[PDB]
């Protein structure tokens, strides 16, 4: 009985994973536009905050490379409120 039913559970797991795979291009496109939205917002507010500061390059990379670096949590949610910070950075861990 456990043989038949765990084989059925594996086939159901494959069906769930194929649904996930079929949705991953759309979610990746939305995630890319999401992070570029948040980085552009942080860049514009860095341009309007860091005017009085002498010798400040706005949008200066901390890396010598010109390769795209995956953004950090503090790079995205740095200027936002503490509730959005907590819901993005401890939300899955603190979920139930």
């Amino acid at each position: 009985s456990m043989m038949r039913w765990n084989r059925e559970r594996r086939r159901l797991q494959i069906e769930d994973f194929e649904a996930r795979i079929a949705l991953m291009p759309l979610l990746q496109a939305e995630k890319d536009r999401r992070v570029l939205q948040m980085l552009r917002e942080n860049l514009e507010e860095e341009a309007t905050i860091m005017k009085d500061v002498p010798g400040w390059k706005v949008g200066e990379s901390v890396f010598h490379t010109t390769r795209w670096v995956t953004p950090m949590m503090g790079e995205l949610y740095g200027l936002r409120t503490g509730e959005e910070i907590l819901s993005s950075t401890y939300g899955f861990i603190w979920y139930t």
């Binding site: 769930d16 950090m72 949590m73 503090g74 995205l76 740095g78 503490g82 910070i85 401890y90 861990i93």
Partner: protein, 169 residues
């Protein structure tokens, strides 16, 4: 305040270490190490080490500190200045470090330390339908073959060694 939860648990962790390391008695030192192990487990749990934190509770506090309290109960007797003085010494050193790294967002004792909440350094992506921590621990059986061999050999030898040196002959 709530974005600093791992930091506040780490302050409780250092306070517990100053507690038992000032050594009042092995009974209360065991109690302080139990409370310290619990809050350091909470530190691990707030990064996503759920299995490793339950390894802290189940193995560290669950077996080993139970054996420490057991062996203490067979070696101490049930019924100071230096302990309380060293306690408040370590507490003042820790709170002065907290005050510096909070008012300055920067300190340097041995290394340079940020003063913001350690939420900043996390990843912004998902792991899909697994835990990366669980799959890396699960790879002890497919990738950690030599590691399993030397760990099991050390534990078997450890059983042999404890039966040798407690035999008295």
């Amino acid at each position: 305040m709530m974005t600093y939860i791992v930091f506040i648990l780490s302050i409780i962790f250092v306070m517990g270490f100053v507690g038992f390391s000032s050594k009042p008695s092995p009974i209360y030192g065991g109690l302080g190490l139990i409370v310290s192990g619990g809050v350091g487990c909470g530190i691990v749990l707030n990064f996503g080490g759920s299995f490793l934190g339950l390894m802290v509770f189940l193995i560290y506090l669950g077996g080993m500190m139970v054996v420490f309290g057991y062996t203490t109960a067979m070696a101490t007797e049930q019924y100071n200045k230096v302990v309380l003085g060293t306690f408040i010494t370590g507490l003042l050193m820790e709170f002065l470090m907290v005050y510096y790294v909070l008012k300055d967002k920067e300190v340097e004792i041995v290394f340079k330390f940020n003063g913001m909440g350690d939420w900043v350094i996390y990843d912004t992506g998902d792991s899909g339908f697994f835990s990366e921590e669980a799959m890396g621990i699960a790879a002890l059986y497919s990738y950690g073959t030599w590691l399993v061999i030397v760990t099991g050999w050390s534990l078997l030898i450890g059983v042999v060694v404890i039966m040798e040196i407690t035999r008295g002959n």
